[PDB]
RNA sequence: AGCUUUACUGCAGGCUGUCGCUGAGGACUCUCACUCCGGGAGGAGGACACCGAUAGCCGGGC
RNA sequence: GACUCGUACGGUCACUGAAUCCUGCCCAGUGCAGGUAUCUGAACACCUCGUACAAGAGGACGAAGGACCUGUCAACGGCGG
RNA sequence: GAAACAUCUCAGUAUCGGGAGGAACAGAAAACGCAACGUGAUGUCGUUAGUAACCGCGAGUGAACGCGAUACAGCCCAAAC
């Protein structure tokens, strides 16, 4: 479906309707310093490594909407539920 | 499965060993401080069980009695010589350096003093080609050009018993008897005729290899069978 | 040839014999080792924990 | 002022630089051609020896023991083993090479008891340790107020029971507080969890 | 349970880089460790190889 | 340590299975092997960022191997609509 | 066992190798860390507690400091001279 790059709507922060801008959440890079990263190194040795020996799952036929709503005045973004959509394009 | 035959071999049990206790003499060149003054007389010509070829008994000036890798034409009475100054005739042993190029040689040393390594089977012979203050080029019986120290000693002539391979064994019984004098398990069963458990080629409803016969060099023993690291197979092309 | 009764006939070889060290007829006169006490193999006496129940 | 010893010790703080370095590059050549256990008249590292209990006296012996380097020389499994126990290569022994040397030496001298040991270098494939042993039966020692303790019956085979210095350290008994819950008073008493 | 394989996961083994042993003056010389031949004298080789450690690949041989 | 008191007229690994007349075509896939501009290719050391250090992120170089190319069927096998 | 199974669990158990004693081992802090103006070698018992901690964060696994007791004990070299 098509979707407006910008539009009016409720900003949970300002607590009043304002022009938000919609962006697609870009994957944040990892530091490899989280506990899970440590436990991987720690708990991996000879033979099968248990949970650490598993591999990537699969894909759903369609993914849900992963968007960021940015307030046009305070610049503070907010998240919303997503909806299944084969393709999402922004208008303007 | 079970270790394949090639694996039982390594263990060195009876079945796979050579009846050493029945072998005559570890044929190796004599040693001479220097000078070359050494020489002995051929006393007899015997049959060497280990090589199915004749070997000559010799008594040296210093009363030393030993068997020698005999070239062709060496008869009793003959006088052989072993040293830097040894004459250039068949039977004599001397460093490649002193041997004239173009002369057929047998029982050549790899490293000077090792007592002989190359060319020692029935009728084979190496070939001295190039001389140098550094390297002596010998063309081994396999057709390969071997670069050797001109100090490596070797015997003049070709090994005795040549042509032994010309007559077929004709019957299993003749192989049997020969085989019994070597470190070899005989007869031979083809993998393809065994059970899957016993060999990578075993199994199936009919006899055939279950994979391509050409195995990788990096293959582990137990799986390395068939055509080992073949650069090619067949006769065509 | 049956592996049974008929193959019993050739059994006239002597192996295990009265042991000089423990007195048991376990000395293999061909091996020169006692299967019971270990005489011939071990200076110490042949003994294993599995000769009785674990908690005993 | 600095003692003579201090110089011997200061030299070994860096066995790869200076004279000691050249010394080693030489000695090993002969050590390599020696046996597994070679009794030696004088300790190579006098300061260290003296420091560990050594005394130029009767009943006090010294021997250099050679032990191979690396992980455990292990045989791969010949029966069912879950992936965790299928290891061979990375498995290592729980006794450090130095404790292995102390044992191999003591076995060479069935009448003596291990007092201590110290390292004397290593080449590319082996490590050498000099072990100080003591004759618990020589009166020269039964009367030594600084060593007669090693004569008591309960000090018999002390190395094979890990009562040695490197023994106790290797048993993880160094700390008297945190981290020694499973080690003191004994590994076997703690259910072999240390 | 035995057996198979491009089933899952691992383990040997082979190949290969790297670190240590290990030294003098991206290609090169040397000799002194180390290796090998030699009865020895000495010869070949040589900081490689072997061995220890690690990394990538192959890996139903298990 | 066996082979081996052995040395290519050797002995290892496989297939076929006396003699006689013969043994066509296929290298695409798989296997083995050789080559390789370029691509891909780990760890150590090295460069940048980060941290008074460190974890960590990135770069440069690039082995075997793979991509790609070639050889090979008395190599696995194939010889149709 | 985990209602399969690979980490985990059974378990540092079974079993194996080496060795001491009448008991062994431990032991006079590079401790503790109820953080203190505090405790004061070490075993062990009761408790702390199925707590903290671990774990396909599944099934399961699992201490310590302290406290109350038992018994009490503190010393010898290396080196300086
Ligand atoms: Cl989206
Ligand atoms: Cl033959
Ligand atoms: Cl002892
Ligand atoms: Cl307290
Ligand atoms: K299990
Ligand atoms: Mg693992
Ligand atoms: Mg021989
Ligand atoms: Mg033939
Ligand atoms: Mg035979
Ligand atoms: Mg056959
Ligand atoms: Mg059959
Ligand atoms: Mg198989
Ligand atoms: Mg057939
Ligand atoms: Mg067939
Ligand atoms: Mg039967
Ligand atoms: Mg106790
Ligand atoms: Mg089954
Ligand atoms: Mg040698
Ligand atoms: Mg299997
Ligand atoms: Mg047939
Ligand atoms: Mg279960
Ligand atoms: Mg479950
Ligand atoms: Mg547990
Ligand atoms: Mg604590
Ligand atoms: Na851990
Ligand atoms: Na088959
Ligand atoms: Na002893
Ligand atoms: Na532990
Ligand atoms: Na079965
Ligand atoms: Na093809
Ligand atoms: Na091909
Ligand atoms: Na179950
Ligand atoms: Na099951
Ligand atoms: Na787990
Ligand atoms: Na309190």
PDB file of N, CA and C (backbone and C1' of nucleotides) in Angstrom, chain D residues 1 3 5 50-51 82-85 94 107 146 156-157 160-161 163 168 171 176-178 184-186 191-192, chain G residues 6-9 11-12 18-20 25-32 41-43 64 76-81:
ATOM      1  N   UNK D   1      73.504  -4.959  51.875  1.00  0.00           N
ATOM      2  CA  UNK D   1      73.592  -4.729  50.402  1.00  0.00           C
ATOM      3  C   UNK D   1      73.012  -5.922  49.669  1.00  0.00           C
ATOM      4  N   UNK D   3      72.465  -9.301  47.917  1.00  0.00           N
ATOM      5  CA  UNK D   3      73.209 -10.527  48.179  1.00  0.00           C
ATOM      6  C   UNK D   3      73.586 -11.124  46.832  1.00  0.00           C
ATOM      7  N   UNK D   5      73.062 -14.020  45.725  1.00  0.00           N
ATOM      8  CA  UNK D   5      71.873 -14.711  45.269  1.00  0.00           C
ATOM      9  C   UNK D   5      70.991 -13.819  44.415  1.00  0.00           C
ATOM     10  N   UNK D  50      67.704 -22.608  47.464  1.00  0.00           N
ATOM     11  CA  UNK D  50      67.841 -22.188  48.858  1.00  0.00           C
ATOM     12  C   UNK D  50      66.518 -21.634  49.371  1.00  0.00           C
ATOM     13  N   UNK D  51      65.874 -20.831  48.535  1.00  0.00           N
ATOM     14  CA  UNK D  51      64.603 -20.216  48.874  1.00  0.00           C
ATOM     15  C   UNK D  51      63.522 -21.246  49.180  1.00  0.00           C
ATOM     16  N   UNK D  82      28.368 -39.165  24.002  1.00  0.00           N
ATOM     17  CA  UNK D  82      27.618 -38.005  23.552  1.00  0.00           C
ATOM     18  C   UNK D  82      28.637 -36.961  23.079  1.00  0.00           C
ATOM     19  N   UNK D  83      28.249 -36.124  22.126  1.00  0.00           N
ATOM     20  CA  UNK D  83      29.158 -35.126  21.561  1.00  0.00           C
ATOM     21  C   UNK D  83      30.056 -34.403  22.557  1.00  0.00           C
ATOM     22  N   UNK D  84      29.575 -34.218  23.778  1.00  0.00           N
ATOM     23  CA  UNK D  84      30.363 -33.520  24.791  1.00  0.00           C
ATOM     24  C   UNK D  84      31.611 -34.278  25.195  1.00  0.00           C
ATOM     25  N   UNK D  85      31.527 -35.599  25.177  1.00  0.00           N
ATOM     26  CA  UNK D  85      32.645 -36.419  25.584  1.00  0.00           C
ATOM     27  C   UNK D  85      33.419 -37.032  24.423  1.00  0.00           C
ATOM     28  N   UNK D  94      44.634 -32.138  34.428  1.00  0.00           N
ATOM     29  CA  UNK D  94      44.413 -31.243  35.554  1.00  0.00           C
ATOM     30  C   UNK D  94      45.645 -31.051  36.436  1.00  0.00           C
ATOM     31  N   UNK D 107      59.712 -40.929  41.790  1.00  0.00           N
ATOM     32  CA  UNK D 107      59.646 -42.350  41.447  1.00  0.00           C
ATOM     33  C   UNK D 107      61.035 -42.885  41.129  1.00  0.00           C
ATOM     34  N   UNK D 146      65.434 -27.674  60.565  1.00  0.00           N
ATOM     35  CA  UNK D 146      64.690 -27.024  59.494  1.00  0.00           C
ATOM     36  C   UNK D 146      64.173 -28.001  58.439  1.00  0.00           C
ATOM     37  N   UNK D 156      55.167 -39.614  53.965  1.00  0.00           N
ATOM     38  CA  UNK D 156      55.550 -40.642  53.013  1.00  0.00           C
ATOM     39  C   UNK D 156      54.777 -40.459  51.719  1.00  0.00           C
ATOM     40  N   UNK D 157      55.482 -40.487  50.592  1.00  0.00           N
ATOM     41  CA  UNK D 157      54.851 -40.316  49.275  1.00  0.00           C
ATOM     42  C   UNK D 157      54.076 -38.989  49.187  1.00  0.00           C
ATOM     43  N   UNK D 160      52.790 -37.799  45.711  1.00  0.00           N
ATOM     44  CA  UNK D 160      51.699 -38.513  45.060  1.00  0.00           C
ATOM     45  C   UNK D 160      50.352 -38.215  45.701  1.00  0.00           C
ATOM     46  N   UNK D 161      50.372 -37.454  46.784  1.00  0.00           N
ATOM     47  CA  UNK D 161      49.134 -37.105  47.455  1.00  0.00           C
ATOM     48  C   UNK D 161      48.938 -35.596  47.392  1.00  0.00           C
ATOM     49  N   UNK D 163      50.854 -33.080  48.411  1.00  0.00           N
ATOM     50  CA  UNK D 163      51.236 -32.306  49.590  1.00  0.00           C
ATOM     51  C   UNK D 163      52.407 -31.383  49.291  1.00  0.00           C
ATOM     52  N   UNK D 168      49.773 -28.309  46.181  1.00  0.00           N
ATOM     53  CA  UNK D 168      48.732 -27.547  46.840  1.00  0.00           C
ATOM     54  C   UNK D 168      48.230 -26.390  46.001  1.00  0.00           C
ATOM     55  N   UNK D 171      46.050 -27.684  43.397  1.00  0.00           N
ATOM     56  CA  UNK D 171      44.790 -28.169  43.947  1.00  0.00           C
ATOM     57  C   UNK D 171      43.863 -27.003  44.242  1.00  0.00           C
ATOM     58  N   UNK D 176      42.394 -18.288  50.636  1.00  0.00           N
ATOM     59  CA  UNK D 176      41.826 -18.744  51.894  1.00  0.00           C
ATOM     60  C   UNK D 176      40.380 -18.285  52.004  1.00  0.00           C
ATOM     61  N   UNK D 177      39.930 -17.538  51.003  1.00  0.00           N
ATOM     62  CA  UNK D 177      38.570 -17.034  51.020  1.00  0.00           C
ATOM     63  C   UNK D 177      37.718 -17.397  49.820  1.00  0.00           C
ATOM     64  N   UNK D 178      37.315 -16.381  49.063  1.00  0.00           N
ATOM     65  CA  UNK D 178      36.475 -16.575  47.888  1.00  0.00           C
ATOM     66  C   UNK D 178      37.158 -17.465  46.852  1.00  0.00           C
ATOM     67  N   UNK D 184      39.303 -26.299  49.403  1.00  0.00           N
ATOM     68  CA  UNK D 184      39.684 -26.657  50.770  1.00  0.00           C
ATOM     69  C   UNK D 184      38.484 -27.370  51.407  1.00  0.00           C
ATOM     70  N   UNK D 185      38.726 -28.312  52.335  1.00  0.00           N
ATOM     71  CA  UNK D 185      40.005 -28.798  52.851  1.00  0.00           C
ATOM     72  C   UNK D 185      40.621 -29.836  51.926  1.00  0.00           C
ATOM     73  N   UNK D 186      39.800 -30.395  51.046  1.00  0.00           N
ATOM     74  CA  UNK D 186      40.255 -31.398  50.100  1.00  0.00           C
ATOM     75  C   UNK D 186      39.346 -31.424  48.877  1.00  0.00           C
ATOM     76  N   UNK D 191      33.608 -33.401  46.719  1.00  0.00           N
ATOM     77  CA  UNK D 191      32.952 -34.103  45.632  1.00  0.00           C
ATOM     78  C   UNK D 191      33.563 -33.923  44.262  1.00  0.00           C
ATOM     79  N   UNK D 192      34.845 -33.598  44.221  1.00  0.00           N
ATOM     80  CA  UNK D 192      35.525 -33.419  42.950  1.00  0.00           C
ATOM     81  C   UNK D 192      34.947 -32.337  42.064  1.00  0.00           C
TER      82      UNK D 192
ATOM     83  P     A G   6      21.128 -37.145  23.364  1.00  0.00           P
ATOM     84  O5'   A G   6      21.738 -35.753  22.898  1.00  0.00           O
ATOM     85  C5'   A G   6      22.929 -35.719  22.121  1.00  0.00           C
ATOM     86  C4'   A G   6      23.401 -34.303  21.929  1.00  0.00           C
ATOM     87  C3'   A G   6      23.251 -33.354  23.115  1.00  0.00           C
ATOM     88  O3'   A G   6      24.446 -32.608  23.289  1.00  0.00           O
ATOM     89  C1'   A G   6      22.298 -32.396  21.166  1.00  0.00           C
ATOM     90  P     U G   7      25.449 -32.993  24.483  1.00  0.00           P
ATOM     91  O5'   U G   7      25.542 -31.658  25.346  1.00  0.00           O
ATOM     92  C5'   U G   7      26.254 -30.504  24.855  1.00  0.00           C
ATOM     93  C4'   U G   7      25.750 -29.241  25.516  1.00  0.00           C
ATOM     94  C3'   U G   7      25.582 -29.277  27.023  1.00  0.00           C
ATOM     95  O3'   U G   7      26.805 -29.141  27.719  1.00  0.00           O
ATOM     96  C1'   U G   7      23.737 -28.174  26.056  1.00  0.00           C
ATOM     97  P     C G   8      27.018 -29.925  29.102  1.00  0.00           P
ATOM     98  O5'   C G   8      25.648 -29.737  29.878  1.00  0.00           O
ATOM     99  C5'   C G   8      25.313 -28.490  30.480  1.00  0.00           C
ATOM    100  C4'   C G   8      23.939 -28.572  31.075  1.00  0.00           C
ATOM    101  C3'   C G   8      23.730 -29.721  32.037  1.00  0.00           C
ATOM    102  O3'   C G   8      24.247 -29.397  33.312  1.00  0.00           O
ATOM    103  C1'   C G   8      21.922 -29.637  30.538  1.00  0.00           C
ATOM    104  P     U G   9      24.815 -30.558  34.256  1.00  0.00           P
ATOM    105  O5'   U G   9      23.616 -31.600  34.320  1.00  0.00           O
ATOM    106  C5'   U G   9      22.412 -31.263  35.005  1.00  0.00           C
ATOM    107  C4'   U G   9      21.504 -32.453  35.072  1.00  0.00           C
ATOM    108  C3'   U G   9      22.105 -33.712  35.663  1.00  0.00           C
ATOM    109  O3'   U G   9      22.065 -33.688  37.087  1.00  0.00           O
ATOM    110  C1'   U G   9      20.958 -34.235  33.673  1.00  0.00           C
ATOM    111  P     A G  11      24.468 -39.613  40.047  1.00  0.00           P
ATOM    112  O5'   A G  11      25.153 -38.181  40.011  1.00  0.00           O
ATOM    113  C5'   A G  11      26.270 -37.893  40.853  1.00  0.00           C
ATOM    114  C4'   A G  11      27.338 -37.187  40.066  1.00  0.00           C
ATOM    115  C3'   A G  11      26.915 -35.878  39.399  1.00  0.00           C
ATOM    116  O3'   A G  11      28.043 -35.001  39.373  1.00  0.00           O
ATOM    117  C1'   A G  11      27.798 -37.314  37.789  1.00  0.00           C
ATOM    118  P     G G  12      28.214 -33.853  40.488  1.00  0.00           P
ATOM    119  O5'   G G  12      29.729 -33.405  40.277  1.00  0.00           O
ATOM    120  C5'   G G  12      30.800 -34.070  40.968  1.00  0.00           C
ATOM    121  C4'   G G  12      31.133 -35.395  40.304  1.00  0.00           C
ATOM    122  C3'   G G  12      32.237 -36.177  41.009  1.00  0.00           C
ATOM    123  O3'   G G  12      31.980 -37.565  40.818  1.00  0.00           O
ATOM    124  C1'   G G  12      32.890 -35.821  38.821  1.00  0.00           C
ATOM    125  P     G G  18      48.431 -48.854  40.059  1.00  0.00           P
ATOM    126  O5'   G G  18      48.930 -47.523  40.773  1.00  0.00           O
ATOM    127  C5'   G G  18      50.000 -46.759  40.206  1.00  0.00           C
ATOM    128  C4'   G G  18      50.254 -45.519  41.020  1.00  0.00           C
ATOM    129  C3'   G G  18      50.340 -45.693  42.524  1.00  0.00           C
ATOM    130  O3'   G G  18      51.577 -46.217  42.970  1.00  0.00           O
ATOM    131  C1'   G G  18      49.004 -43.817  42.045  1.00  0.00           C
ATOM    132  P     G G  19      51.590 -47.282  44.173  1.00  0.00           P
ATOM    133  O5'   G G  19      51.275 -46.420  45.474  1.00  0.00           O
ATOM    134  C5'   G G  19      52.292 -45.587  46.045  1.00  0.00           C
ATOM    135  C4'   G G  19      51.695 -44.551  46.972  1.00  0.00           C
ATOM    136  C3'   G G  19      51.117 -45.005  48.300  1.00  0.00           C
ATOM    137  O3'   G G  19      52.101 -45.286  49.285  1.00  0.00           O
ATOM    138  C1'   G G  19      49.681 -43.416  47.346  1.00  0.00           C
ATOM    139  P     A G  20      51.684 -46.097  50.613  1.00  0.00           P
ATOM    140  O5'   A G  20      51.253 -44.963  51.639  1.00  0.00           O
ATOM    141  C5'   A G  20      52.162 -43.912  51.982  1.00  0.00           C
ATOM    142  C4'   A G  20      51.503 -42.943  52.926  1.00  0.00           C
ATOM    143  C3'   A G  20      50.996 -43.528  54.228  1.00  0.00           C
ATOM    144  O3'   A G  20      52.036 -43.708  55.177  1.00  0.00           O
ATOM    145  C1'   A G  20      49.332 -42.136  53.309  1.00  0.00           C
ATOM    146  P     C G  25      47.743 -35.904  55.658  1.00  0.00           P
ATOM    147  O5'   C G  25      46.996 -34.774  54.827  1.00  0.00           O
ATOM    148  C5'   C G  25      46.631 -35.009  53.455  1.00  0.00           C
ATOM    149  C4'   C G  25      45.384 -34.238  53.103  1.00  0.00           C
ATOM    150  C3'   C G  25      45.420 -32.762  53.442  1.00  0.00           C
ATOM    151  O3'   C G  25      46.096 -32.023  52.446  1.00  0.00           O
ATOM    152  C1'   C G  25      43.382 -33.670  54.190  1.00  0.00           C
ATOM    153  P     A G  26      46.953 -30.744  52.871  1.00  0.00           P
ATOM    154  O5'   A G  26      45.877 -29.793  53.555  1.00  0.00           O
ATOM    155  C5'   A G  26      44.736 -29.310  52.821  1.00  0.00           C
ATOM    156  C4'   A G  26      43.807 -28.571  53.751  1.00  0.00           C
ATOM    157  C3'   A G  26      44.430 -27.398  54.483  1.00  0.00           C
ATOM    158  O3'   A G  26      44.320 -26.246  53.669  1.00  0.00           O
ATOM    159  C1'   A G  26      43.242 -28.756  56.014  1.00  0.00           C
ATOM    160  P     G G  27      45.564 -25.249  53.512  1.00  0.00           P
ATOM    161  O5'   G G  27      45.707 -24.598  54.957  1.00  0.00           O
ATOM    162  C5'   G G  27      44.699 -23.711  55.462  1.00  0.00           C
ATOM    163  C4'   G G  27      44.914 -23.459  56.933  1.00  0.00           C
ATOM    164  C3'   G G  27      46.313 -23.012  57.319  1.00  0.00           C
ATOM    165  O3'   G G  27      46.415 -21.600  57.151  1.00  0.00           O
ATOM    166  C1'   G G  27      45.588 -24.736  58.769  1.00  0.00           C
ATOM    167  P     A G  28      47.778 -20.951  56.617  1.00  0.00           P
ATOM    168  O5'   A G  28      48.666 -20.886  57.939  1.00  0.00           O
ATOM    169  C5'   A G  28      49.423 -19.704  58.286  1.00  0.00           C
ATOM    170  C4'   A G  28      48.572 -18.761  59.110  1.00  0.00           C
ATOM    171  C3'   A G  28      49.346 -17.896  60.094  1.00  0.00           C
ATOM    172  O3'   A G  28      48.679 -16.663  60.330  1.00  0.00           O
ATOM    173  C1'   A G  28      47.902 -19.357  61.275  1.00  0.00           C
ATOM    174  P     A G  29      49.012 -15.393  59.411  1.00  0.00           P
ATOM    175  O5'   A G  29      48.114 -15.674  58.125  1.00  0.00           O
ATOM    176  C5'   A G  29      48.256 -14.874  56.940  1.00  0.00           C
ATOM    177  C4'   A G  29      47.221 -15.265  55.913  1.00  0.00           C
ATOM    178  C3'   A G  29      47.116 -14.303  54.741  1.00  0.00           C
ATOM    179  O3'   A G  29      46.633 -15.023  53.614  1.00  0.00           O
ATOM    180  C1'   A G  29      45.075 -14.346  55.883  1.00  0.00           C
ATOM    181  P     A G  30      47.666 -15.667  52.572  1.00  0.00           P
ATOM    182  O5'   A G  30      47.982 -14.494  51.547  1.00  0.00           O
ATOM    183  C5'   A G  30      46.919 -13.787  50.891  1.00  0.00           C
ATOM    184  C4'   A G  30      47.209 -12.307  50.888  1.00  0.00           C
ATOM    185  C3'   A G  30      46.161 -11.433  50.224  1.00  0.00           C
ATOM    186  O3'   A G  30      45.158 -11.135  51.192  1.00  0.00           O
ATOM    187  C1'   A G  30      48.346 -10.762  49.574  1.00  0.00           C
ATOM    188  P     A G  31      43.659 -10.770  50.736  1.00  0.00           P
ATOM    189  O5'   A G  31      42.772 -11.736  51.643  1.00  0.00           O
ATOM    190  C5'   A G  31      42.794 -13.158  51.437  1.00  0.00           C
ATOM    191  C4'   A G  31      41.847 -13.848  52.387  1.00  0.00           C
ATOM    192  C3'   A G  31      40.447 -13.269  52.467  1.00  0.00           C
ATOM    193  O3'   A G  31      39.626 -13.694  51.395  1.00  0.00           O
ATOM    194  C1'   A G  31      41.259 -13.598  54.642  1.00  0.00           C
ATOM    195  P     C G  32      38.655 -12.636  50.690  1.00  0.00           P
ATOM    196  O5'   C G  32      37.530 -12.388  51.793  1.00  0.00           O
ATOM    197  C5'   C G  32      36.964 -13.492  52.526  1.00  0.00           C
ATOM    198  C4'   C G  32      36.272 -13.015  53.786  1.00  0.00           C
ATOM    199  C3'   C G  32      35.172 -11.976  53.652  1.00  0.00           C
ATOM    200  O3'   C G  32      33.955 -12.549  53.206  1.00  0.00           O
ATOM    201  C1'   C G  32      36.488 -11.512  55.555  1.00  0.00           C
ATOM    202  P     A G  41      41.073 -17.218  64.036  1.00  0.00           P
ATOM    203  O5'   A G  41      41.583 -17.916  62.704  1.00  0.00           O
ATOM    204  C5'   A G  41      42.380 -17.203  61.739  1.00  0.00           C
ATOM    205  C4'   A G  41      43.243 -18.177  60.979  1.00  0.00           C
ATOM    206  C3'   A G  41      42.491 -19.380  60.444  1.00  0.00           C
ATOM    207  O3'   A G  41      41.824 -19.116  59.230  1.00  0.00           O
ATOM    208  C1'   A G  41      44.380 -20.136  61.593  1.00  0.00           C
ATOM    209  P     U G  42      40.389 -19.783  58.963  1.00  0.00           P
ATOM    210  O5'   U G  42      40.686 -21.346  58.951  1.00  0.00           O
ATOM    211  C5'   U G  42      41.708 -21.898  58.110  1.00  0.00           C
ATOM    212  C4'   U G  42      41.779 -23.388  58.298  1.00  0.00           C
ATOM    213  C3'   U G  42      40.436 -24.079  58.255  1.00  0.00           C
ATOM    214  O3'   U G  42      39.954 -24.226  56.931  1.00  0.00           O
ATOM    215  C1'   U G  42      41.660 -24.908  60.083  1.00  0.00           C
ATOM    216  P     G G  43      38.481 -24.809  56.692  1.00  0.00           P
ATOM    217  O5'   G G  43      38.718 -26.370  56.768  1.00  0.00           O
ATOM    218  C5'   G G  43      37.617 -27.236  56.914  1.00  0.00           C
ATOM    219  C4'   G G  43      38.001 -28.432  57.727  1.00  0.00           C
ATOM    220  C3'   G G  43      36.769 -29.139  58.213  1.00  0.00           C
ATOM    221  O3'   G G  43      36.235 -29.890  57.166  1.00  0.00           O
ATOM    222  C1'   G G  43      38.203 -28.828  60.028  1.00  0.00           C
ATOM    223  P     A G  64      28.722 -23.481  51.636  1.00  0.00           P
ATOM    224  O5'   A G  64      29.261 -21.989  51.530  1.00  0.00           O
ATOM    225  C5'   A G  64      30.403 -21.682  50.728  1.00  0.00           C
ATOM    226  C4'   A G  64      30.632 -20.196  50.710  1.00  0.00           C
ATOM    227  C3'   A G  64      30.627 -19.518  52.069  1.00  0.00           C
ATOM    228  O3'   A G  64      31.891 -19.595  52.716  1.00  0.00           O
ATOM    229  C1'   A G  64      29.206 -18.340  50.613  1.00  0.00           C
ATOM    230  P     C G  76      59.416 -19.319  65.484  1.00  0.00           P
ATOM    231  O5'   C G  76      59.737 -20.371  64.337  1.00  0.00           O
ATOM    232  C5'   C G  76      60.235 -21.677  64.656  1.00  0.00           C
ATOM    233  C4'   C G  76      60.724 -22.353  63.407  1.00  0.00           C
ATOM    234  C3'   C G  76      61.643 -21.497  62.558  1.00  0.00           C
ATOM    235  O3'   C G  76      62.982 -21.542  63.032  1.00  0.00           O
ATOM    236  C1'   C G  76      59.979 -22.454  61.187  1.00  0.00           C
ATOM    237  P     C G  77      64.096 -20.601  62.358  1.00  0.00           P
ATOM    238  O5'   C G  77      64.323 -21.253  60.922  1.00  0.00           O
ATOM    239  C5'   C G  77      64.990 -20.532  59.879  1.00  0.00           C
ATOM    240  C4'   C G  77      64.644 -21.130  58.543  1.00  0.00           C
ATOM    241  C3'   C G  77      65.285 -20.457  57.343  1.00  0.00           C
ATOM    242  O3'   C G  77      66.607 -20.975  57.147  1.00  0.00           O
ATOM    243  C1'   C G  77      62.980 -20.851  56.913  1.00  0.00           C
ATOM    244  P     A G  78      67.760 -20.046  56.514  1.00  0.00           P
ATOM    245  O5'   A G  78      67.085 -19.401  55.225  1.00  0.00           O
ATOM    246  C5'   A G  78      66.890 -20.178  54.041  1.00  0.00           C
ATOM    247  C4'   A G  78      66.381 -19.310  52.918  1.00  0.00           C
ATOM    248  C3'   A G  78      67.085 -17.985  52.707  1.00  0.00           C
ATOM    249  O3'   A G  78      68.332 -18.144  52.058  1.00  0.00           O
ATOM    250  C1'   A G  78      64.757 -17.701  52.461  1.00  0.00           C
ATOM    251  P     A G  79      69.643 -17.482  52.704  1.00  0.00           P
ATOM    252  O5'   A G  79      69.393 -15.918  52.553  1.00  0.00           O
ATOM    253  C5'   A G  79      69.310 -15.303  51.259  1.00  0.00           C
ATOM    254  C4'   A G  79      68.832 -13.875  51.389  1.00  0.00           C
ATOM    255  C3'   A G  79      69.618 -12.976  52.329  1.00  0.00           C
ATOM    256  O3'   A G  79      70.817 -12.489  51.735  1.00  0.00           O
ATOM    257  C1'   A G  79      67.321 -12.671  52.717  1.00  0.00           C
ATOM    258  P     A G  80      72.084 -12.147  52.666  1.00  0.00           P
ATOM    259  O5'   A G  80      71.719 -10.722  53.284  1.00  0.00           O
ATOM    260  C5'   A G  80      71.337  -9.619  52.442  1.00  0.00           C
ATOM    261  C4'   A G  80      70.805  -8.482  53.283  1.00  0.00           C
ATOM    262  C3'   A G  80      71.706  -8.037  54.422  1.00  0.00           C
ATOM    263  O3'   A G  80      72.707  -7.139  53.945  1.00  0.00           O
ATOM    264  C1'   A G  80      69.480  -8.265  55.207  1.00  0.00           C
ATOM    265  P     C G  81      74.254  -7.548  54.053  1.00  0.00           P
ATOM    266  O5'   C G  81      74.545  -7.480  55.614  1.00  0.00           O
ATOM    267  C5'   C G  81      74.336  -6.264  56.346  1.00  0.00           C
ATOM    268  C4'   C G  81      74.499  -6.521  57.819  1.00  0.00           C
ATOM    269  C3'   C G  81      75.705  -7.371  58.151  1.00  0.00           C
ATOM    270  O3'   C G  81      76.903  -6.615  58.135  1.00  0.00           O
ATOM    271  C1'   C G  81      73.834  -8.236  59.273  1.00  0.00           C
TER     272        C G  81
END
